[PDB]
C-alpha cells in the first residue's frame, strides 16, 4: 500500500479500553483525614465523559490501600488484547508520589508498576493513562497579576 | 556512522514507556477542590474532553485544561493562608506517539 | 451557575505556569550518554527539531523524541549491570498554550 | 477584526529569546565525579539547532554551583520584553530535582524560581523551557521485547 507513518497510537481496536475510577470520599477516622466533598461530582462527570469516548468505565468508591492494590493488580492481569488503551483516575488525598487509600497511603509507583510494559503484555505499546486529582505537596501558589 | 548503543537486533522499548500522567497540580503543591462543584482539574478536564476529544490530539487537549485551570480559577477561604491561591496542572508524558480518541 | 473560586475581578496566573521541562529520562532513572556521539536525548532532540521545528507544535516534536530514544537506543557496557538498558524521555508540561517555533 | 482564538503562544516578538546552554564536562576532583565525555557534541549540536530557530545562544562550560546560580540570576534579571521565550539547557550529572555544578549540586527549583511568573515579569505569560540531560535516580530500565 502507500506510505505508512505511524505517528499516532492505533485507537481502532474493538474496544477503547478500561477507565477505572477510584473515588475516595470518606476516610477512616483513624487517619484523621476529612471527607472530600464534591468528589462525587468529579466521579460522575468522569464517568459520563469517558462513557462518550466509548470507554468501559468502572467506578470504585472509598477503597482501602489494600483494595486499591488488589483492584489494580486484578485489572492489570486482565486480557487487554482487544483494547486500545487503559485509563485510571485517582480522586483522593495525597502527597508527592503518594495516593491515599481510605485507611492509608499507596505509592503511585506501586499502582503503575502493574502496568509496566513487561508486566502487562496485552497493554505493551499501548497508551496507559493515569489522571490524578490529589495534592503533591504543601506549597501554595500566590500567582501573579496579568 | 555506527555506535554500540543503537540499531539493536532484538527491538525493545522501555518498560516505563507509553505512560501519561495527567497531574492536577504542579510538583510539591496543594490541589484545589470546590466542595460543591468538584475539583478544578476534573471540571476542566471533562469540559475540555467533551469539547475537543473528537478534534484534538490528547496533549493539546490537556494544554487547554492547563490554561482553563490556571486562568479561570482562584481559591477562596476564610483562612488568609489558603485564600486567593492559584493552580497549574502538570502534564507528564512518556508516550511515544500522538493520541487521538477518535479514528 | 456561580462559585467562590472562579471568574476573579483581577486576573492572575500561577507563578509556576508557562514552564516546560524536557527531561532526558523517567523519574528515578539513570540517563544515558555515548562517550563519542553524545547523550541519547540531545542527539534525538536536535535531530527532531531540525526536522520538525517548522512543521509541528513543540509537544508533538518532543513526542517524536520520546519514540526515537525509546526505540533506537540500548546501552552497551562491559558491566552486565549497565548493559542492555533502555531509556524513556520525560515531558513535563505546565505551558498554557501550544508552542510553534515558526509563525 | 475577525475571530481571535489565542491557542498558541505569541512567538513573533522581535527576538525568539535566549538559549542558555550550561555544558558541564570537567568536575573538581574533590567531588569524585568523572568527566562527561561526548557532552561537547551535545552542546555544539544544541547551539547549531537553536541557532537555526533564531535563538540568542549563550554557552557556558564547566560552571560551579555558585556560577550557575549567578548566571541564572543575572539572566533572569535581564529585560526580556522584546523576547518571545526563554530556553535553558543543562548538560551534567544529577539526581532527582538536582543538577551538579562542577563543585557541587544545585536544586533545579533554585534555578527555575528566578524565572517564576512573579520574579521575572518580562517573561510572564511567555514559554520558559528547561531541557535537562542528567540522571534523576539510579534505576535501570531493562525494557521489554516488541
Swiss-Prot record, chains A, D:
Residues with S-nitrosocysteine modification: 135
Disulfide bridge partners, by residue number: none
Active-site positions on this chain: 93, 135
Protein name: Caspase-3 subunit p17
Swiss-Prot record, chains B, C:
Residues with PTM (Microbial infection) ADP-riboxanated arginine: 33
Signal peptide: none
Coiled coil: none
Top-level division of the source organism's lineage: Eukaryota
Protein name (record): Caspase-3 subunit p12
